[PDB]
Symmetry: D3
Subunit: 253 residues, 6 copies
C-alpha cells in the first residue's frame, strides 16, 4: 500500500474547503456526516465527549468517504498527539496555541526523530496500516498537516512569531474562545471582535499560511470565504440536530 | 417510591401527542432529542441498530426530561418484550401485528401471571427500581401501554378483530410498510394508500382506541392531526440530521 | 490444554452449593462477586440487561476465581444456547421449561451432532480456547451441565415427565414466577406455594436429579438446605447493593 | 449517491473469490483483515461473539477497502435478517438451511413487499445511507446476495429442491457441521465426507448456482478451487492469530 | 431552559449533606445509587476506572433523581476539568491540592475568560444543553461549585493560604491519603491523625468555607457531623457490595 | 486473600522470560494471547488504542492464565500510573525515561506515602480486590515491579545514573525509538545501532538490573537471549495477525 494522500493538506494551496464540526462523538453519527460531501470533518476531542478509542471509530467510519478527517485533541499534549497520529489522524487542530515555542513543540510532536519527538510504533499503528504501508517511517510527515488555534490575547500577542514557525500549515481562529478572551463572551459578532478577526486572517495569508475559522453564521462564513480564508467550518452537528428538531416541533407546538 | 406515571398512556384520551423518531441509537443523541419538548420519543429497536443495552442507556438519558419514551422492539417476540419491560419501557410499539390472536399474545406478554405471561423478576429490574417501588408487582400493569402496528394487507384484513382486543391501547399505521404491502413501495402519498389510511384512522377512533402514525410530510401530519389522530410522529432524528447538514452545505457547495 | 472441569456439575452429587445471583450486568461487578467465595454465580441473561458480549466479559472476569459460572439465557432459544456454549458457559439454566419435549430439545441444544443439534464452530469458540483444547469436539459434553426451571402450572403438570429426561442434570424452582402462576404474585411465602415447593423438591430428589432454588429469605434458604436441595442461591447483587446503601443512609437519614 | 455495487454477487459468475473468516468480533480486528486483499470477509454472527452493533462497526471498518463483506446471522431469523440488511450487509450466509420452504422464506426475508417480507425503514438505514441513495427502495434487491448453508443430512436430503429456489445465489457447504451430522465429528478429511462434499459441489454448479466452502486445509482448499468452487474461505482470523503466536513461542519455548 | 440549579452548592450554607462514593464506574450502578436518597453522589474519576465518557453516562443516569452529582477528576488537570464541566458536572472535587497558587488555578479552570481559563464550547456541551440554556455563557459560574482536597503534609502546610482563595467553596479532608502522608498508612483512626483532622475541620469552618470528609466508620462520620462538617460521605458502593455479599455468604459458609 | 504474587518480578533474577506484545486493544484478543504460554504479555497503552478501561478488561482476561501482565502507559504520567496500579497492573513499563530524576519520580509514583506519591484508594481498587486483600496497604509494594525504557540519546546520556536508582527493577531498550533517535529510523539492524544496544545490555546487567528488549527478528532475539537479557518480547499480535493473513492469501493470490 502507499500512504493515504492528505487531500486536505494539498487543498490548503489550491481551493477553499468547507467544513462540518462533528461533536456527536460516535462512529454512526460521523458516518452520517461523511455522506453529505463536506471537504472536511472536525472530530472534536476538546469540546465533545471523545477519547482516543471513539476518535478511531469515527476515523474508520469517515475513511470510506471523500470527506477529509481533522482531529482536535483536548490540548497540545505531546503523548496524546502521538496517540492520535498512530490511530491514523493525518490532520490535527491544536487548541489555544500562544507562542512560537509552543507551536514549534507541536511541529516536533508530529515528526519522527531525529527531527521531531513523535514516538515510533509503526508495527501497532493504523497510521502505517500495521506496516502494510512498507515505507511509512520514511514518508509519514509528507501527509501530516499541523493546524494551530489562535484564540486568546496571548495568541494574538505572539501571532507574527507563530506565523514564522516552519511546519505550521494553518492558523485557525476560534471566535468563541477569542471573543471571551476579549471581554465579549457570547458576542463574537461585535465589530471590535470582527475587526481583529479580519486583520488576523489578512496577516495569516500574508505570511503564506492557510487561515481557518468556524462560524455557524452564514453571512460571517461567506464574508470569511470572500476574504480568501482557506478552511471554513460552517456548522456543528449537535447544533444542526437540536435546531432542526426544535424548528420541526414549532410547526405543531 | 411510587411507580413512574405513564403520562403517554393518560394523554391518549385527553390530547394529541407530537412524537420524534429516535434512530441515532445512542444515549447522548437521545438526550439531545429529549431537550426539544416532544410529547413522545420513539426509541426504534426495529429499524435502528439498537439492542436491550443501548435502549436502556436511552431510557436513562430521556428519564430526566418530560418527553415520554415509547420503545419499538424488532418483532413481537415475547422474551424480548419481557426484557424491554424490565429495563423500564412503559410503552411498547409492536411492528407488523396481523391478527387478534397475535394482538392478544402481545397483551399477555405485557401482563404478569396469572392474567398474562410476563416473566417475574422485580428484584433485578430498573422497572421496579430494584424493588424500591415497593408494590410494583401489584401496580405495574396500570402504567404499561401496548400499541400495535397495522402495516400489511393481513393487518387490514384483521383490523376489526384487532380493534376488539382488550388491552390494545392504540393502533399505529406504518405508511412505509403499508404502501409497500399495497404495491406502492416508496409512494405512500398516492391517493389509493391515503384513502386506506384515512378510513383505518376513522375505524380505530370509532372503536374507542388511540390512532397513531408517522409522517415526515408536514401537510400529511397536519391532516392526520385534523382527523383527530391521538399520537403523530412528525420526523426522524437521522433524517433531520442528514437534511440539515445537506441544506447547510448547499449554501456554500 | 484439557477442557475446563465443570466442578458445579461434579458437586451436584457430592455437596450443597451456595449461589449468588449476578444481575449488575457488567464484568467489573461480576469480578467483585467472584472474590466473595460463592460456590456458583448466576449470570442472568433473562432478567438483567445482558447480551452475549456482556455475558462473555463476565465469564472472563469470573474465570480467574474458583466460583463456577452458570448462565441463564432469556428463553430456551436453540441458537442463543449455541452462542452461550461457544463463549464458554458450561452450565445453563433454562427458564420456564414446561414439557419433556421442551426439556429434550434443551438437551439436544447442548450436544453436538449426531446425538444433538449444537452447531459446530470450535475454531472460533472460547469454549475450545480456539482449538487450544485439542480434543474439545470429543470431550465437550462431559463438562456441560443442563438445568431447567419449573416455575409455571404447566411445568408442575409435566414435572414427572421432565424428571425422566436423560441429560437434564437439575430442576430449579422459580418462586417469583411460580407464586405468580399460582395467583399468589409477590407472595411466595404463602403456605399454599411453600407446600408445592417442598413436594416438588422431594420429587426432584426422588427421581435422582439435583434440586435448586433462589430465596433471599434466610429462613426459607436454610429450610431448603435442610431438605437436601443441591443448589441454593441465597441473594441477588442488585438487591444487596440497594439494601446495603438504604440501610447505611437510614443511620444518618 | 448510487447504491453500493455488490462486487461479490457479480463475481459469482466471473471468477473464484478467496475468503477470510472474521471471528475476532471487533471493528479494529476487521480493519486489519480488510488490509490484506481477500476477495471477501465473512463477519461471523453465528460462531463469534457478535451482535448487530458489533457487525455494523465491522461493516464500517471494511467499507473503506475493496474486500467485500458477507455476514452470517446466528440463524435464518427473519427479523434479524431485516436488521442486518438495514445496517447495510449486502451479502448474507444463512446457516443450517434444510428445505426449499426455508430457502424460499430466506429469499422473501431479503426482498421488500409486495414480493418479499423485508421490513421497510429506509430513512433510518445505513443501507440507503439514510435516504442519501434516493431510489434505494426501487434498486435495493439488485445488489442483495443470498447464500444458504447445506451442512446437515436434512439439507443434503433437500439439496435438489433448495437448488431450484429462485433467488438463492449460492450454496455454501459447512464441513464442521456436515462431518458432525454424518457421525465423523472433528474428521471432515475422511473419504466418506469428502466424496459427499465433491458430489454436492458438482450438483450445485450443475444447477447454475455458486458453490462455496471453508477449509483451513490448503490441499483441500486448492482441490475445491480445482473443482470450480466459486467462493472458498481459506482460513479463520482467530485460528491464524493463535497458530502464529504458538509457532513463534515454540522457536524459544 | 434555565441552567440546572446546583442544590449541593446552595446547601453548603444551609444543611449537612450525606454522600455516597460511586466507584462501580457504570451508568446502571450509578442509577441504583441515585434511587437511595443520598444528598450527593461522588463519581470517582481518581480511584475508580472511569473516563469522561463513563462519567457522562453516570451524570445522565443520576440526572433524573434528586441526588446531586459531584465529580472527582484523576488530578487538577485544567483540560480535563474543561471536559468534565462541558459534559455538565456542576461540582468538582480536586484531589491533592497543596498550595493557594494551585487552588487559584483550579478556580480559573472553572470560570470562562476573561476572569478564568475554562475553554468556551457551549454549542457542543451537555452543560448548556447544546445552547438550549440560552444565557449559559453569562450564568454558568453561578451554579459551578469548586471543592479542593487537603490530604498531604504540603496541603496542611498551605491550609490558611488555600482557605483565603475566593472561589474555593469547600475543602474536603482525605483520611486515607492524609494518614499515609503522616506515616499512619491504613490507620487513620489513630489519635495523632484524628486530632489533625478535627483541628483542620474547625479551621475550614472558621474561614467561612464548607468542610467535607469521607468515613465508612459510622462513629467517626457521626462525630464529624457533630463538629458541623457540611458534606460527609458515609460509605462506598464497591465496599458495601463486597461486605453485603461476604456477610450473606457467612450465614451459610 | 493474599496479594497476587508478581512471578514476573521474581523471575527477573531466576530465568529469561519470553514476551508477546499485545496491541489488539481488546479483552477477547488478550485472552487468545493468554492461552499461548508466553511468560509475559505487554498490554500497550502507548502505541495501541487502549485506555484505563480497555486495559482493565485485558487484565481481567489474562488473570485466569499463568502469563504475567505488564502494562505500558502512554507516558510517565504520575496520575495515570496511579490509575493503572489501582486496576491491578503489578508491572509497569515506562516509555522514554531520560534521567535519574525522572526514574526516581517513577519509583515514587509506584509507592504509597510516606515513601512515595501513589494515591491511596484501596477500598475502590481491583489491586486490593476492594480490600478483600486485608493487608494490601502494608504489602502492595513487595509485588510491584517498575521497568523503564531507555530509547533516546538523552536516555543513553543518563544510563549510568538511571542504573543507580533503587526501585528501578529493569531497563528495557526500545529499538524503534532508539534507531530513530540515532538517525537510523526504520533501520535498527544497522551495526552502529546494534553495538550500542549490546553495550547497553552489558551495562544494565553489570549494574545488577534486569535488561529487556523487543525484536520480531528471530536471530536478533536469540542473540539478545545469548547475552543473558532477562525479558525479551519476540513478537507483536497485530504484526503476527497481518503477516499470517498475508502469507495465507499469497498461497492462492
Ligand atoms: Ca451490545
Ligand atoms: Ca473509553
Ligand atoms: Co476554542
Ligand atoms: Co413499519
Ligand atoms: Co423465574
Ligand atoms: Co456450520
Ligand atoms: Co485521597
Ligand atoms: Co519505544
Amino acid at each position: 500500500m502507499v500512504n493515504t494522500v492528505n487531500y486536505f493538506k494539498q487543498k490548503l494551496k489550491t481551493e477553499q474547503q468547507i467544513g462540518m464540526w462533528v461533536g456527536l462523538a460516535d462512529g454512526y453519527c460521523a458516518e452520517i456526516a461523511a455522506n453529505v460531501g463536506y471537504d472536511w470533518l472536525l472530530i472534536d476531542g476538546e469540546h465533545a465527549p471523545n477519547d482516543v478509542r471513539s476518535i478511531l471509530a469515527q476515523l474508520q467510519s469517515i475513511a470510506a468517504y471523500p470527506s477529509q478527517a481533522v482531529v482536535r485533541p483536548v490540548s497540545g499534549d505531546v503523548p496524546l498527539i502521538k496517540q492520535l497520529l498512530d490511530i491514523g489522524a493525518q490532520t490535527l487542530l491544536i487548541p489555544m496555541v500562544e507562542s512560537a515555542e509552543q507551536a514549534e513543540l507541536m511541529v516536533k510532536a508530529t515528526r519522527y526523530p531525529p527531527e521531531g519527538i513523535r514516538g515510533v510504533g509503526a508495527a501497532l499503528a493504523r497510521a502505517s496500516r500495521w506496516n502494510n504501508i512498507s515505507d511509512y517511517l520514511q514518508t509519514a510527515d509528507e501527509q501530516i498537516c499541523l493546524l494551530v488555534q489562535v484564540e486568546s490575547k496571548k495568541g494574538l500577542d505572539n501571532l507574527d512569531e507563530i506565523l514564522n514557525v516552519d511546519g505550521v500549515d494553518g492558523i485557525f481562529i476560534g471566535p468563541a474562545d477569542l471573543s471571551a478572551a476579549l471581554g465579549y463572551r457570547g458576542n463574537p459578532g461585535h465589530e471590535f471582535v470582527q475587526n481583529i478577526i479580519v486583520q488576523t486572517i489578512q496577516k495569516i495569508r500574508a505570511a503564506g499560511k492557510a487561515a481557518g475559522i468556524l462560524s455557524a453564521d452564514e453571512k460571517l462564513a461567506k464574508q470569511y470565504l470572500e476574504l480568501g480564508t482557506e478552511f471554513v467550518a460552517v456548522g456543528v452537528d449537535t447544533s444542526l440536530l437540536m435546531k432542526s428538531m426544535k424548528q420541526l416541533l414549532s410547526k405543531f407546538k
